[PDB]
Amino acid sequence: MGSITENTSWNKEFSAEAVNGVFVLCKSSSKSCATNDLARASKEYLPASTFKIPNAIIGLETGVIKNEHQVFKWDGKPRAMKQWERDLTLRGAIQVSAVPVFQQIAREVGEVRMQKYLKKFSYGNQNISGGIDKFWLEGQLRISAVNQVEFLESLYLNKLSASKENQLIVKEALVTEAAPEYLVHSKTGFSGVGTESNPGVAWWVGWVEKETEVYFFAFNMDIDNESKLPLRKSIPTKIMESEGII
Ligand SMILES: [Cl-]
């Protein structure tokens, strides 16, 4: 990225709920970004389900996902969340964060092709060890908020090393709010509640298109109690509202 500037005034939205986290916000491009915590902005964490973004692109690139209208059928066997116990489109599986759908995508991509594309994407530490179907959930893969916004800006610009059509397919799957002159693409993640002295991580990453401007953002926070999870959206939303983005 370009320049990044620490703005400690944003910390008021964190301390209010005793949250340790970072928000990175870039206007127009990574030319100029702002953050509440420069050290944490470059610290790398498990991506959890924010990894569905590169995984979906790689699945399309490799042909494992045949096209954007593929239906991922539920075999009827129990899944960890009831919202996953149904047939899903690609967008549906991303939007409900259907881990088992993407675990099978990763298995079929395989370790050689997965490694190749994370290198091409400069995705975090590019470490896929720990099992092909779980390296982003409990393995050694790590990515920073800075790296997320660089990756997302490349996607927005169709500059990732993947076909433009596959990048466009994944982008429509990430739309979460649509209005005439306001468009949000975003993705959550949550590694879990961690262990004693080692909290989990929660994420919200995406970008906002308002009129003729675009803003890229990445948020993460330490979390050891699932009741705090909605803060991964509310804190960055309050910050973006205070910046006039909404
Ligand atoms: Cl499951």
From Swiss-Prot:
Reactions it catalyzes: a beta-lactam + H2O = a substituted beta-amino acid
Q: Name one GO molecular function term.
A: penicillin binding
| Positions contributing to a beta-lactam binding | 97, 188, 190, 232
Q: What regulates the activity here?
A: Activated, with respect to most beta-lactam substrates, in the presence of 0.05 M sodium bicarbonate.
Q: What is known about this protein's pH dependence?
A: Optimum pH is between 6 and 7.
Identify the PROSITE patterns for this entry. BETA_LACTAMASE_D
What is a biological process (GO) this protein takes part in?
Answer: cell wall organization
EC numbers = 3.5.2.6
Q: Which family does it belong to?
A: Belongs to the class-D beta-lactamase family.
This chain's protein is named: Beta-lactamase OXA-10
Organism equals Pseudomonas aeruginosa
Classification lineage? Bacteria, Pseudomonadati, Pseudomonadota, Gammaproteobacteria, Pseudomonadales
